[PDB]
Amino acid sequence: MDILLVDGYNMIGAWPQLKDLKANSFEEARDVLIQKMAEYQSYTGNRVIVVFDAHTNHRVEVIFTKENETADERIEKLAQALNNIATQIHVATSDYTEQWAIFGQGALRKSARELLREVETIERRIERRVRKITSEIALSEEVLKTFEKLRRGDLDAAA
Incomplete structure (x- = not known):
C-alpha cells in the first residue's frame, strides 16, 4: 500500500453522506471528499489522487479529466505511469x-464501502486519541503526526 487512486464522483454517489449534497454541481460533496481524503493521507501516509469527471486541495492531488476523457481513462493513465517495483497501487x-481493468495494470481494487469504512475507522481512532488528550507530550506528538495540518491548529485551539 502506497498510492490510492480515487474515483471522485463514484464515491459521492455511493457514500450516504455525499449522496444528498447535490447543490451547485456537487460543490460541498466535492470539498468534503477531499477533506476526508486529506485525513486518510495524513493518518496512513499513503498518497491520495482523486480523479473527477469533467462536467481546493489540502495537499491532496485532485485531477480533473479532459473534455473527451473519463475518470476510468485517467486512473488507467496514472496506474501505468506510477506502477513500479517498490510501490503498490490501489484504485478506490x-x-x-x-x-475489469484493475488487474490489467497491477492494481488492487477497493470498494466505496471499504474506503468509507476506513475513513470512519480513522476518524474513530482519532476520536479516541483526542479524547485522551483533552482529559489530561510523548503521546500528544504521536497524535499530532497522524492529523492533518489544518486539524492540528484546531485541536491546539481547543486545548
Missing part, C-alpha cells in the same frame, strides 16, 4: 465497468 471505485 465501485463502478462495475472499471472492475
Whole structure:
C-alpha cells in the first residue's frame, strides 16, 4: 500500500453522506471528499489522487479529466505511469465497468464501502486519541503526526 487512486464522483454517489449534497454541481460533496481524503493521507501516509469527471486541495492531488476523457481513462493513465517495483497501487471505485481493468495494470481494487469504512475507522481512532488528550507530550506528538495540518491548529485551539 502506497498510492490510492480515487474515483471522485463514484464515491459521492455511493457514500450516504455525499449522496444528498447535490447543490451547485456537487460543490460541498466535492470539498468534503477531499477533506476526508486529506485525513486518510495524513493518518496512513499513503498518497491520495482523486480523479473527477469533467462536467481546493489540502495537499491532496485532485485531477480533473479532459473534455473527451473519463475518470476510468485517467486512473488507467496514472496506474501505468506510477506502477513500479517498490510501490503498490490501489484504485478506490465501485463502478462495475472499471472492475475489469484493475488487474490489467497491477492494481488492487477497493470498494466505496471499504474506503468509507476506513475513513470512519480513522476518524474513530482519532476520536479516541483526542479524547485522551483533552482529559489530561510523548503521546500528544504521536497524535499530532497522524492529523492533518489544518486539524492540528484546531485541536491546539481547543486545548
